[PDB]
Amino acid sequence: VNSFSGYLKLTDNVYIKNADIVEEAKKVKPTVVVNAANVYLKHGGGVAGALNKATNNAMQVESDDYIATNGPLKVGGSCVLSGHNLAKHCLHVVGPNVNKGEDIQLLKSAYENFNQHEVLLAPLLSAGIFGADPIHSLRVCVDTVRTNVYLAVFDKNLYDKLVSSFL
Ligand SMILES: O=C(Nc1ccc(C(=O)NCc2c(C(=O)O)[nH]c3ccccc23)cc1)NC1CC1
Asked: Alpha carbon of 67 to those of 5, 30, 62: distances in Å?
């Protein structure tokens, strides 16, 4: 038993809810919140901009130190950093950005990072300003992630479409 509320169950291990991941994170304090990061951990907009804003820019400060030490992530890769006031940990995962021409096949590799964590609150990778089809992203999520994932979908219209077209 865990503290996530109001989710619709899609499969044995995947759940979904129309929710703001920031507000969801502040209420649940999950062990892991997933950030839709880029390789530079520059959290300017979308989910990342919103998560970083909610941390009063502490996420960005920590991220800049991480990059200065380690260099950029790979597309499809991830790193674990602090969750600040939102979660114990933040798993920064880089899905491909279609608006940069990145290979959509790397989306499966991106979701594989979730399997290193028993439970996660997360957005749909490569959705929103990353330019992928969220229905495709949901399909890859369900077919790749084996751990328990609680997907927060900000847009109500998109949430209803995801539920209604889901196979
Ligand atoms: O500003 C906010 N929240 C807040 C702001 C923006 C977002 C957001 O861009 N979402 C779309 C998105 C999804 C998805 O929804 O599937 N996946 C993505 C992957 C990469 C980039 C974007 C997305 C989400 C939340 N809260 C303030 C009031 C306290």
From this structure: 35, 25, 9
| CB of 154 closer than 6 angstroms to any ligand 1 atom | yes
Experimental technique, in short, is X-ray
What does each C-alpha distance from 63 to 17, 29, 103 come to in angstroms?
28, 20, 25
For residues 91 and 32, the answer to whether their CB atoms sit within 8 Å is: yes
* 3 falls within a domain: no
**Cα–Cα distance measured from residue 73 to residue 89, given in angstroms and rounded to the nearest whole number:** 17
Judge whether 25 lies within some domain.
yes
Helix 21-28 and helix 46-54, axial crossing angle in degrees, nearest 10? 40
8 Å CB contact between 100 and 126:
no
Using most ligand atoms within 8 A of CB, pick from 47, 99, 157, 158 the residue to mutate for ligand 1.
47
The residue whose C-alpha atom lies closest to atom 17 belonging to ligand 1 is 127
Q: Is 136 in the pocket of ligand 1 (CB under 6 A)?
A: no
Q: How many domains does the chain have?
A: 1
Domain that residue 146 falls in: 8-165
Distance 155 CA to ligand 1 centre (A): 8
CATH number at residue 128: 3.40.220.10
Resolution to 1 decimal place, in Å: 1.0
